[PDB]
C-alpha cells in the first residue's frame, strides 16, 4: 500500500541532479558530496581508491538510511589539491584498472578455451 516503487531506486528523477556538491566550512579544502540512486556498490569502491592517494587527508561517506537509495561522501585533501581533482583522478584510475582487468580476463578465457 505504502510500498515504494522498485523502479525509483535507480532511475534518477529529472528535477534532482545525479550528484550534488557542497563545501564544508568547518575546515578548509573540504567538500561534501550528495550522491543519488547509488549505494555501497559505488561508494565503497571510490572510497577504497581515494584513501590510497597520499594527498587526500579525509575521505568518508555513509548510507544515511537504507530505505532511501543515496549516500553522502565527505572528502578533504590537503591544500595542494582541490578535492574534486582528486575525485576525478580516482575515477580515471579505477576506469583504467577495470579496462586492464577486462583485457587480461579476455586473454585468459581465450587461451582457456
Amino acid at each position: 500500500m505504502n510500498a515504494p516503487d522498485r523502479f525509483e531506486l535507480f532511475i534518477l528523477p529529472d528535477d534532482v541532479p545525479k550528484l550534488k556538491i557542497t563545501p564544508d566550512s568547518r575546515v578548509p579544502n573540504c567538500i561534501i558530496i550528495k550522491f543519488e540512486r547509488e549505494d555501497h556498490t559505488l561508494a565503497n569502491l571510490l572510497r577504497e581508491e581515494l584513501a590510497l592517494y597520499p594527498d587526500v587527508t579525509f575521505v568518508a561517506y555513509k548510507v544515511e538510511h537504507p530505505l532511501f537509495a543515496n549516500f553522502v561522501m565527505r572528502l578533504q585533501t590537503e591544500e595542494g589539491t582541490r578535492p574534486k581533482q582528486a575525485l576525478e583522478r580516482a575515477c580515471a584510475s579505477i576506469i583504467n584498472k577495470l579496462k586492464t582487468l577486462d583485457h587480461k580476463f579476455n586473454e585468459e578465457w581465450n587461451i582457456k578455451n
Partner: protein, 436 residues
C-alpha cells in the same frame, strides 16, 4: 501531516505519564510506525506485533503545549525514582560493551568513516592511540567522541585500584574515557549513569543527541564486526559436567539423609513450623543451594569469548539463572510456593511408588535444557509454567483496578502558588510539597 510536526504518541495501556509523549514526524514509506529502539523502554513495548496510537493536534496552542511539555527529551528523567528512564538497550549495549574492551583497535579508514557517522562531530580527527608502527585507535576514543565535552564521571567497582587491572570502574575527564568497560552499569538507565549526568549538565537536547550519536557509532562498529550466538555457547567441557553431577549427587544424598532423620523424628523443629513444614523448607533450601552451586561452576567454566557470557556481562539480556538453567540444571519446581503436591493418592504421578519424597519424585528437574527432560520432569515444568501464566493473567487485572482507584483518589491535588498542596475544595494536605 508534514515533516517536523509534533504529534502525540501513545501505547495502551498507559500506566505512567511516560507511556505517552510527543514526537517529531518524519514521513517514510511502507505501513508501520517507526521508533528509536531506546524509547521503547518507557513504552514497555516490543516489535513483536504491538500497536501504538497517534493523536494529532488541531490548533497552534496545542502544538505549543506538545512541543514544550511532552517532548521526549524532557521526559528522560522520571520523577517516580529521580532516575533516567530510557537508555542503551539490546544490540547497542552488547556492542558498546565489546567496543570498549581494552583489546579493540580500529584501522584508519574505518575510524575515518565512523567519525563521519556522528552528526555532532566537531570535525577534528583525534590523534591515534598508537602512532607507530601503524596508526591505530582504541574504541574508547571513538566513544568519547560521542560524549560531549566537559563531562566528569567516576565510579568504584569492587574496591578497584586506579590501575583498574580488571578494567572495572569508570572514569571520564572532560568527555573522554580514561579507562573502564562501558556497559549497563554506566550507560544504562540506572541513576548516576552517564545519561543522568549529561541531562543534568547540558540539558535535554544534548542528551537526545547523545543517545543518537552513541547508537549510530556502536551500530556501525557492530555491523562491521559481527556478533552472534550458537548452540555451542550452551555447552561445557566434560570436567564441568563431572563437577555438576557430583554436586547434584551430593545434594540428593543430603536430602536423603534429611528424609531418613526426619522419618525417625531426629530432625529438629524450626520455630513456628511443624515437622512437615520445617522438613519441606530444609529440602527446598538444600535443592536451591545445589542448583546455585552447579550454576556457579558452569559460570566459572565458560570462556570469556562465549557469546552468552558476553551478552550477560554486558547486561543486555538474560542473567546468571538463565545460564544455570540452560547448562547446569533446571532446578526444583515451585507451585504455589511448595513442591509438587500429591494429586494422586500419596504420589505425584503413577510412574512413582506410594510414599516417596525424593527430589525427582516431587519435581526436581535435574537435566539442563541442552540435555533435554524426561517425561515426568517435562510435565512438572509444564505445571510450573501454567501456574505462572495464570499468575500474570490474574495479577494484571487487580493491579489495574488498584491503579484506577488510586488515580481517582488523588486526581485533584495541585501544588498552589503559595507552596501548599490542596485538593479541589482548597483543603490543605501538606504545607509544602514533600516538605521541600
Amino acid at each position: 501531516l508534514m515533516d517536523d510536526d509534533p504529534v502525540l504518541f501513545n501505547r495502551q495501556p498507559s500506566l505512567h505519564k511516560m507511556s505517552m509523549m510527543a514526537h517529531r514526524v518524519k514521513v517514510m514509506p511502507y505501513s508501520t510506525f517507526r521508533l528509536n529502539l531506546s524509547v521503547t523502554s518507557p513504552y514497555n513495548a516490543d516489535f513483536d506485533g504491538d500497536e501504538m496510537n497517534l493523536h494529532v493536534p488541531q490548533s497552534e496552542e496545542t502544538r505549543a503545549e506538545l512541543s514544550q511539555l511532552c517532548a521526549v527529551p524532557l521526559q528522560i528523567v522520571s520523577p517516580q525514582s529521580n532516575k533516567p528512564v530510557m537508555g542503551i538497550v539490546q544490540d547497542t549495549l552488547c556492542g558498546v560493551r565489546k567496543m570498549t574492551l581494552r583489546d579493540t583497535f580500529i584501522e584508519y579508514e574505518q575510524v575515518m568513516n565512523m567519525l563521519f557517522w556522528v552528526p555532532s562531530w566537531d570535525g577534528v580527527v583525534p590523534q591515534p592511540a598508537i602512532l607507530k608502527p601503524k596508526p591505530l585507535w582504541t574504541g574508547k576514543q571513538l566513544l568519547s567522541i560521542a560524549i560531549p565535552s566537559g563531562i566528569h564521571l567516576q565510579r568504584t567497582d569492587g574496591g578497584n585500584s586506579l590501575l583498574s587491572p580488571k578494567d572495572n570502574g569508570m572514569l571520564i575527564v572532560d568527555g573522554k574515557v580514561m579507562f573502564g568497560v562501558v556497559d549497563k552499569k554506566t550507560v544504562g538507565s540506572g541513576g548516576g549513569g552517564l545519561i543522568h549526568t549529561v541531562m543534568r549538565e547540558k540539558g535535554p537536547k544534548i542528551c537526545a543527541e547523545l543517545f543518537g550519536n552513541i547508537q549510530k557509532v556502536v551500530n556501525y562498529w557492530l555491523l562491521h564486526n559481527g556478533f552472534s550466538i550458537g548452540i555451542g555457547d550452551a555447552i561445557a567441557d566434560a570436567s564441568t559436567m563431572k563437577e555438576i553431577t557430583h554436586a547434584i549427587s551430593s545434594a540428593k544424598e543430603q536430602v536423603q539423609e534429611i528424609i531418613y532423620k526426619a522419618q525417625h523424628n531426629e530432625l529438629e523443629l524450626k520455630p513456628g513450623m511443624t515437622l512437615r513444614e520445617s522438613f519441606e523448607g530444609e529440602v527446598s533450601r538444600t535443592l536451591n543451594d545445589a542448583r546455585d552451586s552447579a550454576g556457579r561452576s558452569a559460570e566459572m567454566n565458560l570462556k570469556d569469548l562465549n557469546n552468552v557470557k558476553q551478552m550477560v556481562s554486558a547486561g543486555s539480556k538474560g542473567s546468571f539463572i538463565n545460564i544455570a538453567q540452560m547448562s547446569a540444571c533446571v532446578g526444583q519446581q515451585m507451585v504455589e510456593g511448595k513442591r509438587i503436591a500429591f494429586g494422586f493418592a500419596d504420589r505425584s504421578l503413577p510412574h512413582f511408588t506410594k510414599d516417596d519424597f525424593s527430589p525427582e519424585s516431587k519435581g526436581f528437574v535435574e537435566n539442563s535444557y541442552l540435555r533435554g527432560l524426561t517425561p515426568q520432569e517435562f510435565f512438572f515444568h509444564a505445571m510450573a509454567g501454567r501456574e505462572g501464566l495464570i499468575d500474570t493473567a490474574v495479577k494484571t487485572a487487580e493491579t489495574g483496578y488498584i491503579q484506577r482507584r488510586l488515580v481517582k483518589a488523588l486526581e485533584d491535588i495541585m501544588v498552589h502558588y503559595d507552596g501548599t498542596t490542596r485538593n479541589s475544595l482548597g483543603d490543605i494536605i501538606q504545607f509544602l510539597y514533600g516538605e521541600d
